[PDB]
Point group: D2
Chain length 346, copies 4
C-alpha cells in the first residue's frame, strides 16, 4: 500500500536527494512538489526541483508549485540573484534546462506559462488531497515551513487532517547556521510555531541530532559507484559532485571529515519509521530571542524528572536517533533508488 504525499522543499543538494528517494520509492506516491525560499530565491528552488525531476525522467509526471518568496514576518536570507548562485552548484544543468518538459501544474491551474505561477497555487490541490484522505494527509517538509504556515492560515480546519514529517531543528546537539538553531527553523520560526499550535500531527523526523550521523563516507561513495556506474557513469559523477559540493565548508567550518545528508532522512521516516526512535513532548520554538530565534526548546528534561507534574500538552514527536541497523537501512534505500535512476537514464 503506497502512501500519498506532497513534498515541500528548497533544493538545495539535500532536497534533490530527498526528491529522488520520494519519487522513485514505490512506497511513496508523490502528488506534487512545492518549493519555498531558502538560501536562494523561491524562483531558483522551483527551477532546481524541476531540474531534479527532469534528470530522473519525471518532470512530465509530477506538478511543481512555486511557493512563497519570504518568511511570514521576517526578511528573506536569500542571496541576491546578482550573486549568480544556482542553488545546485557542482554540475552543468544546461542540457537538463533545455530539454525541460511542460510543468503539469500549468494545466491543473489553467495557466499558459510559468510566469503566471503564484505562491498560493498549491492550496486547492492540497485541500483536495486533505479532504479525500481517510485519516490524515502526509506532507514531507525539508526547507522553511512558510508554505505550510500560509496554507494553514487559509485553511485552519485542515490542520487536524495533516501529518507533517520534517527535516528541521536540533535538540540534544547545537545548531549549524546559528549557535543553537538549525537553518530550516531559524529562517522562519514563526511558521513552525504556528504549525505546532495549529493541530497538525508534527514529527521532527530528521533533526541535526540524526542527520549529523548520516555521513557521506568513502564507503558510501563506493557503494553508490557500484550501484550506478554500470548503468550510467554520467549520473554517477553528477550525484557524487552534488553530494560533495560543500565538503570543504563542512570540514573547515564545521569539523566534518565526511559531510552529512539531511533531507532524504525525513522521507525515509515516512517509508520506514521502524528505524527511528520516537518521543512525544511539548516543543516551544523561540521567536523573541535576538540570537536564539528558531531554537527548538522541549520539556523532555521535565518528563525524565517528574512526568505527572507537567503542564503543557504534547504537540510533537521528536526522533532523537536511528535504531541499530537504521543507518545501513537508510543507505541501502538511497543506493537502491540511485541504482534505479541510473538504469532509467542509461
Amino acid at each position: 500500500m503506497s502512501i500519498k504525499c506532497a513534498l515541500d522543499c528548497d533544493p538545495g543538494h539535500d532536497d534533490l536527494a530527498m526528491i529522488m528517494l520520494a519519487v522513485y520509492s514505490p512506497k511513496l506516491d508523490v502528488q506534487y512538489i512545492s518549493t519555498t525560499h531558502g538560501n536562494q530565491t523561491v524562483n531558483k528552488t522551483y527551477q532546481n526541483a524541476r531540474r531534479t525531476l527532469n534528470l530522473i525522467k519525471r518532470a512530465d509526471k509530477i506538478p511543481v508549485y512555486r511557493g512563497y518568496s519570504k518568511p511570514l514576518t521576517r526578511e528573506s536570507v536569500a542571496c541576491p540573484e546578482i550573486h549568480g548562485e544556482s542553488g545546485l552548484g557542482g554540475v552543468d544543468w544546461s542540457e537538463i534546462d533545455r530539454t525541460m518538459p511542460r510543468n503539469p501544474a500549468l494545466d491543473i491551474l489553467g495557466y499558459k506559462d510559468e510566469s503566471e505561477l503564484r505562491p498560493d497555487d498549491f492550496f486547492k490541490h492540497l485541500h483536495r488531497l486533505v479532504s479525500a484522505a481517510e485519516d490524515k494527509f502526509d506532507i514531507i517538509s525539508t526547507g522553511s515551513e512558510t508554505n505550510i504556515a500560509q496554507y494553514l492560515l487559509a485553511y485552519p480546519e485542515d490542520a487536524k487532517k495533516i501529518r507533517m514529517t520534517t527535516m528541521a531543528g536540533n535538540f540534544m546537539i547545537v545548531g549549524n547556521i546559528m549557535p543553537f538553531a538549525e537553518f530550516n527553523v531559524l529562517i522562519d520560526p514563526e511558521a513552525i510555531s504556528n504549525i505546532l499550535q495549529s493541530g497538525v500531527d508534527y514529527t521532527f523526523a530528521a533533526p541535526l541530532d540524526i542527520t549529523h550521523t548520516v555521513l557521506v563516507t568513502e564507503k558510501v561513495i563506493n557503494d553508490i559507484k557500484a550501484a550506478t556506474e554500470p548503468y550510467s557513469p554520467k549520473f554517477t559523477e553528477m550525484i557524487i559532485k552534488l553530494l560533495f559540493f560543500f565538503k570543504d565548508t563542512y570540514r573547515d567550518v564545521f569539523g566534518f571529515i565526511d559531510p552529512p545528508l539531511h533531507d532524504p532522512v525525513a522521507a525515509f521516516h515516512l517509508i520506514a519509521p521502524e528505524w527511528f526512535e520516537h518521543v512525544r513532548c511539548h516543543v516551544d520554538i523561540e521567536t523573541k530571542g535576538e540570537y536564539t530565534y528558531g531554537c527548538c526548546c522541549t520539556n523532555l528534561i521535565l518528563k525524565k524528572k517528574d512526568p505527572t507534574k507537567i503542564v503543557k500538552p504534547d504537540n510533537a514527536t521528536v526522533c532523537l536517533k536511528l535504531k541499530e541497523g537504521g543507518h545501513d537501512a537508510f543507505w541501502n534505500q538511497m543506493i537502491t533508488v540511485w541504482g534505479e535512476i541510473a538504469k532509467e537514464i542509461g
Copy 2:
C-alpha cells in the same frame, strides 16, 4: 473623475457607515469588499458587510470576499452578531446571491476561501495607471497576506486606513488602537513593503468626530421624510455603544471612526498631512501595536519616511464630513422608501 477602490473592513457599526459612504459616494467606485477578523469572526464580519449592502440595496451589485480568520502570528480575539441594535432577520432572508461567487466560479458561500480576493485585486493593481486605492478599517491581515503572495504589487498600492493613535493614547490597550494591536505584524509588514500608506483616520481625528445631538437632528431632517424606518435604524446603530463610550471612555457623545478614512479618499483637502517614519511595536508585552514615530526628532533636527499621518481635520473639515455623511444617508433613505 471617480476613483476605483476596494474596502477591507470588519463591520462593526463604524465599518457599516464607511461602506454606506464609499458605495453611495459618486467619487468612489467600489470594486469589492473584503472582510477580516476582529471582535467577531471573519464569517460574522462577512455577513455584516452583506447585511449593510442589502440594507442599502447594493448586495446584488458589489462582490464581498471573506478573508483571513486570525492574525499572521498571534491568536484571534474574536468571541463566540457584531451589528447589534437592529433586527437583521428580514435583511438576512432576502439576501441576494453574492456576485463574488460568479467571479470565482463557486456554487455557494461555503467554498469562499481567505485568498479568494487576491486575483481580483491583482487585476485591479495591474490595470491601475499609477496606484490602486485600498481603504482599510479593520485589522490589516488581509493586505499583509496579499503582499506576501504578490510582493511586487506593493509599489502600486495606496492604502488609506483607519488605524493607530499618535498624539493621544489608545483605546483597547493603554497606548495602542484596536486595528493595529489585533495584528501589529501585518501593519509592520505593510509599512516595510513599499506600499504608499496613509494613517488617514487615527484616534487623534476620530475622537473629534462625535455623534452629537446636533448630528442626530441633522440625520433625522435628511432621512425621516423619506424613510422613518431607516432613520431609527441608523440612530440605533450609531448609539449602540454610547453608554460604554461614556462610562468606560469618558465620552459624552460617541465617536464615528471608519467613514473618516473613506472621506479622506473623497476629499483629502480637509486633512492635515505629515510624513514620518512609523515603527509598529511588535516585541512589547503591553504595548504591541503602538504607532511610534520620529515626529519629535524631525522637529528637533536617519530612518526613511514610510507613511503619511493625518493628525487633525482643518477648519470646516468636521462640517464637510457630516454634510457628506448626511447626504449619503439621505440618498439611502430615498432608495429604501417608506
Copy 3:
C-alpha cells in the same frame, strides 16, 4: 507634624525647584539628597544639587550623596552643566563642605561611592514608625539598587514620584516619559518589591502646571522686594527651555514637573488618586518605559494593585501649588537679600 523624607533627583531645573520647595517647606524634614544619572552625568547632577543648596543657604545643612552613574541593565543617555541659564562660578567657589563626608568618615568628595546613601536610608527606614517617605524625580536606579541590597526594607518605604504618563502621550519618546524610559527595569523592580508607590506627578498633571506670565508676575511680586538678583535667576532658570517646549512640544508656556511630587507629600488633598496595576514595558523596542495600567479593565469589570496614580489636581489645586512655591521663593529671597 513634619514628615521626614529623602529626595532622589537629577537636577535639572525642575529638580532645583523641587529641592527648594522640600527644603524650605516646614512640613518636609529633608534628611538627605541623593542624585542619579540623567541627561547629565551623576557627577554633574551631584554638583547641581549642591549648587541649589548653596544658592538657598543650606549646603552646610543637608548631606548630598552621589548615586549610580548608569541604569541597571541599559546604557546611560548622559552627554559630555545641566543647570544652564545662570553663572554658578561664585556659588561653586563658595561651596561649603558636604555634610555627607563627615557622616561617611571621608576626607573628600572623590571618595563618594554610589552606595554611600544605603546605610543612612536603612537607619531612617528602621526608625520609621510606619513607612519612610522618599521623593523621587529622576531615574529610579538608586532606589532599585537600594532594594536589591535591602529587600526586606521595601515594605517600610513609601515613594512619591514625578514619573510616567497615563492618559496622555510621552515626551522624549512617543508613549513614555523620560524618568521611566531611562531605567524602566528599575521602576519595574520597585513596583514588584512591596514599596508603597504613588505616581504623584505624571505628565498628565505636570503638563497642566505651566509657568505663565501671571505666575512670573506673582514670583516677581514675592521676591523682587527682597532680592532682585534671585528674582532674575529663578525666572531665567524657569524659562531656560521655553523655546524648545514651544517649538518642539507645542507649549505656549513651559511645564514645571518635579516640585509637584513634593507638593503631593505636603498637601495630598489637592490630588485625585486611583489604585491600579501598573506594568512597566521593558521588552518593547520603541515603547520601553510605558506605564501600562488596568484602569480601563477596572471600569469594564486579576492582577493585584501595585501603585497609586494621580491623574489630575482638584479644583483649587493649581492655585494652592503656586501659592506654596511662591511662598518658598519669597522666603529664599529674604534669606539671600540684596
Copy 4:
C-alpha cells in the same frame, strides 16, 4: 609567585571543591570569599562557604562575605527555606557548625555579628585589592555573577583592572537546566551581559564543554581514597558522599554514567592555564529569549569562515577543551589538595 584572588561562588558541592583547591593551592592567595544566590538562598550559600572553610581549618583565616539575594532584574530560583534544603546535602554539618570560629569579615567591617552583613560589604575590600594590583586583580566566579555586576555598577572605572575566570556557559554542546543554556548564566543573564560590556578581561575557563569531560569515575574515587584515607578516613567518606550526592540525578536525568565536577576547573585555569585551549571571540548573552535566556552566542563560526569581515570586537576568551594531559593534571592537583587537607584534619 602567588596570585592574589577572590572567590565568588554559591556552594554547592562543586563550589566546595573549588574553595578547597583555591585555598590549599600555594599558587592562589585567596583574599576573601563572597557568596551569591543560587539553587539555595545567599544566606545558605554563605553558611556553606563557612562550613567548607571550617572543615579545612581555614574559617579563622579567610573573610567570607554574604552577597546579593536575587538577580538584577529577574526573580530568584532559590528554593523556599521551608523546603529544608541545606545546599550541601550528603553529610552532617552539626559539628562543623558548632565549632565555627568568628568570621574575620566582621572585624574588617566593624560588625558585632553576622546579622549585620549586607550584600555590598565586599565592595570596599575588592576596591582596595583592585587599586593595589599592578596589572589586573583576579576574580574566580562559579555561581551567578550578580555580585560582580553589582560591584561594576558601583565601581565602573574598576572594570579595566579586573580579570574574571569563570565556570559558566556552554558553547559547542547544549545546556543543563535549560535546553541551550547553563545554570550560572541563565539565573542572571543580564549580570554577565553587563560584565562583558564593562571592559572586564573575561575568560570562560570552564564551560560545560569542558566540565562534562571532567568526570568523577571509579578510578578517580580510588585515587582520592589512596591519598586521603591513610590520614583521615572521616574526610575521605565526607568528600566521596559530597561528590556523589547528585550521581543518580546526573545518571537518570542527564545520561551521566559518572558525574561531572564543574567549579574547581575554573580555579585550575588560574593555577595552570597551559592545560587549556583558548580562543578570543565576541560573546552575546541572550536576555530577550523566552526559552533561551542565558545562551552564550559567539561569532566563532564567522571567524572560521571570513575572519576580516567581522564587525563586533572580541569581548571574551573561551576555553573549549583541555589539552592532552590536562585531565590528568587537573585530577593530580585536586587529589594533592585533598591529601593535604586530610593530613591537617587527621
